[PDB]
């Protein structure tokens, strides 16, 4: 139920969802379903 433009893998480093939108093609540090 999240954006179909999502590329899903976890950032094992700081604890981030690198969730990459292959529309413009950019990796978000972020979690859209959370805050941290």
């Amino acid at each position: 139920k999240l954006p179909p433009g999502w590329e899903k893998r976890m950032s094992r480093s700081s604890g981030r969802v690198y969730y990459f939108n292959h529309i413009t093609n950019a990796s978000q540090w972020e979690r859209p379903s959370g805050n941290s």
Binding site: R9, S13, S14, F20, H22, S27
Partner: peptide, 8 residues
């Protein structure tokens, strides 16, 4: 390929 951002 997109995986594992930390340095950026």
């Amino acid at each position: 390929i997109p995986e594992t951002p930390p340095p950026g």
